[PDB]
């Protein structure tokens, strides 16, 4: 009683799982259909 | 023979703790004679003051 | 060297005392300044490129201010009187091999698991007295421990005659049997020596040893041969190498934390201490407190260093100028 | 401060002259040893880690030997005396702009193509005499030049009272014209100053200048209002910054060439030349020639510095020991 999280409680192991959104560079290209002019 | 903690040297060479003999278990007891202790659920402390 | 701090340690060299601000001309002077309402002490020094000040000691926030002399910081070199055990045999018996083993414990590393073992050996003969035996073993150890090929100075060995009984005759790897002309040698004193010191890189530390003996089978029994009793020390290692590495560390707070790291490009701090001079140390340890809910303490210290001349003249004048200006009772050493 | 060589040049400091090998006991002694036939001269010195000898100078193969006093290596700081042009007007004309330009030539550069210019400006008044013009010009010159937020010191401004005529009145940025109280000023002494010095890294160099004036329209004609003549120099820079750089270069022919480079993993040479003391240099230049086909010379030299106090007491005893041992004719200074 002072006024954190150990790694093993009771023979078990602390699995900290982090899910995060990184930022990925992509490219939007504009190509033409060969047969039709779209 | 740990020469840092054993600082008394024996007259017959080496540290004086090496000449100590210990028979830890005499026979079978059907229980642990010598063991370590814990408190049930005692998580070791880790706390920051920053 | 690297020392531990109570959150800072600042050093100022007192090479002279000038008593006023406008008299600071030579580098290394000191003027302890304080106001008449005894609330703040601070130290103006003449650095080699300008006038510097100390931190402002709040005189009520002082914990201790004790000045230590030059003889309380000198390492005494421990000795060992190696003799023949009289209860085994007073005279050396003519058949056994007489070996002495010196057991070093911090030979190159810092641990006591980094050991070193050097030896000395004499084969004893008939007609060999106790004095002719100590004449044969101090040569055998000086050809082992005090040779010109050893990488580090380990120990210094001497012999003691019974006529003189106090003065040491040194034995090195050039001394012969005919140089030592005495029939009354009664002990072999092995003394610790001064290890090399390079400023800030190789600090003042020593290699300790413990003389251990082998057995002579005097009467069908492997009795130990000798007894090594520690004598009171005589030679001191002076305080010059400790304070020169202590100033070398404490300049890193007011200056560059690196000292030569990268060598087209250093800020070369000019030091004021001489490593061949013995010094007195006064260490004023004070702290900081905000006048609010945060009464929590930030400990500091200021180490002042003045030269010792044998009668503590340069430090006792430094203590008295702090005593009257600031109103503290530093004990005059 | 790298110096050119014919071939390699070894320096040996001479702090003290002893007469035999066994008296060489502390760092800096020297003794000129020679034979009874005077066919080989060499120098034993005591370094911080033992007695070393120089190369053996075959006295038949000497090219020149000359000892130089301390005054000949002192750089005379060049002074410029700025007066008003008497052909134009000895009194300041009312309402014209007096501007002075100082043309610095080697500022922060190794070439004369890196130039720097500092200005000082005075608009003259109606009752402005000659002394009041020199008063306000030296105020305006020192407010531009000798500001504390300048990287390197450039010149010093000195006023001359006509009643004094030999004492320089220093004008800095902190000086106001209230402190300049004389009523007879006839010139403005502008003198170059010492650039900063660290041994080995930064050489001893100086920045030159020439004071140049801008034209004033006096009687419809644009005339230069002043002249800039060079008086005989008064201050000298001492020899301690050259020799402490001269020894540092010759401590790589004997010692290590990698001085400090991989900084914790070095060998460190102790330099036995005080950078704040003057010295006298003796240059002993010689060579070596081979037996049959190797008649080509290896023109090397050994130099010797010795600290002198006014009258050169230490060097003239060192020449006095070489002349009896080697049989040379080195002239005394």
From Swiss-Prot, chain A:
Subcellular location: Virion
The protein's role, per its UniProt record: Forms the portal vertex of the capsid. Probably involved in head assembly, genome packaging, tail attachment, and genome ejection.
Subunit structure: Homododecamer. Interacts with the Cargo protein 1. Interacts with the major capsid protein.
Protein name: Portal protein
Organism expressing this protein natively: Bacteroides phage crAss001
Curated annotation (Swiss-Prot), chain B:
Top-level division of the source organism's lineage: Viruses
Localization in the cell: Virion
Function: Capsid protein self-assembles to form an icosahedral capsid, with a T=9 symmetry, about 77 nm in diameter. Each asymmetric capsid nonamer is covered by 9 capsid auxiliary protein, 1 copy of the trimeric head fiber protein and 2 copies of the dimeric head fiber protein.
Assembly: Interacts with the auxiliary capsid protein (via FD region). Interacts with the head fiber dimeric protein. Interacts with the head fiber trimeric protein. Interacts with the portal vertex auxiliary protein.
Something else known: Displays an HK-97-like fold with an insertion domain that protrudes at the capsid surface.
Protein name: Major capsid protein
Organism: Bacteroides phage crAss001
Portion of the full-length sequence here: 405 to 454 of 504
Curated annotation (Swiss-Prot), chains C, D:
Subcellular location(s) of the protein: Virion
4Fe-4S among keywords: no
GO cellular component terms, A-Z: viral capsid, decoration
Region called FD, residue ranges: 75-237
Major site of localization recorded for this protein: virion
Keywords, comma-separated and alphabetical: Capsid decoration protein, Capsid protein, Virion
UniProt keyword annotation of Nucleotide-binding present: no
Domain observations: The central region FD is structurally similar to Helicobacter pylori flagellar cap protein FliD.
Its biological purpose: Auxiliary capsid protein that forms an outer layer on the major capsid protein protrusions.
Subunit structure: Interacts (via FD region) with the major capsid protein.
Protein name: Auxiliary capsid protein
Gene source species: Bacteroides phage crAss001
């Amino acid at each position: 009683f002072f006024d954190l999280l150990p790694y093993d409680l009771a023979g078990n192991l602390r699995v900290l799982r982090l899910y995060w959104k990184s930022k990925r560079k992509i490219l939007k290209v504009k190509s033409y259909d060969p047969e039709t002019g779209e | 023979d740990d020469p840092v903690r054993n600082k008394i040297l024996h007259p017959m060479g080496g540290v004086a703790f090496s000449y100590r003999y210990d028979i830890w278990y005499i026979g079978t007891m059907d229980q642990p004679n010598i063991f370590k202790c814990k408190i049930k659920g005692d998580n070791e402390y880790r706390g920051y003051q920053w | 060297m690297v020392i531990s701090i109570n959150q800072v340690r600042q050093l100022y060299v007192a090479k002279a005392l000038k008593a006023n601000t406008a008299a600071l001309t030579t580098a290394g002077d000191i003027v302890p300044k304080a106001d008449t309402a005894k609330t703040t002490l601070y130290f103006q020094s003449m650095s080699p490129a300008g006038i510097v000040a100390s931190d402002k000691i709040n005189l009520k926030h002082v914990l201790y201010a004790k000045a230590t002399p030059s003889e309380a910081l000198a390492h005494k070199l421990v000795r060992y009187s190696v003799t023949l055990d009289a209860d085994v045999s007073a005279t050396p018996v003519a058949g056994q091999n007489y070996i002495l083993r010196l057991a070093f414990r911090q030979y190159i590393g810092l641990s006591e698991e980094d050991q070193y073992f050097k030896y000395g050996e004499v084969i004893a003969r008939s007609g060999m007295t106790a004095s002719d035996f100590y004449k044969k073993m101090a040569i055998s150890l000086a050809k082992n421990l005090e040779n010109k090929t050893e990488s580090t100075p380990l120990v210094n060995i001497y012999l003691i005659s019974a006529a003189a009984a106090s003065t040491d005759v040194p034995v090195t790897s050039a001394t012969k049997e005919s140089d030592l002309t005495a029939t009354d040698y009664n002990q072999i004193i092995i003394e610790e020596t001064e290890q090399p010191w390079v400023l800030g890189m190789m600090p003042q530390a020593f290699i300790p040893f413990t003389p251990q003996f082998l057995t002579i089978t005097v009467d069908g029994e492997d009795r130990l041969w000798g007894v090594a009793t520690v004598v009171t020390p005589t030679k001191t290692v002076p305080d010059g190498h400790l304070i020169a590495d202590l100033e070398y560390f404490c300049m890193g707070a007011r200056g560059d934390i690196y000292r030569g790291m990268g060598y087209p490009n250093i800020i070369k701090t000019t030091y004021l201490v001489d490593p061949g001079a013995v010094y007195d140390v006064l260490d004023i340890h004070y702290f900081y407190t905000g006048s609010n809910e945060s009464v929590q303490k930030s400990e500091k210290t200021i180490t002042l260093v003045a030269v010792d001349d044998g009668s503590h003249t340069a430090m006792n004048a430094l203590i008295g100028a702090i005593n009257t200006a600031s109103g503290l009772t530093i004990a005059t050493l």
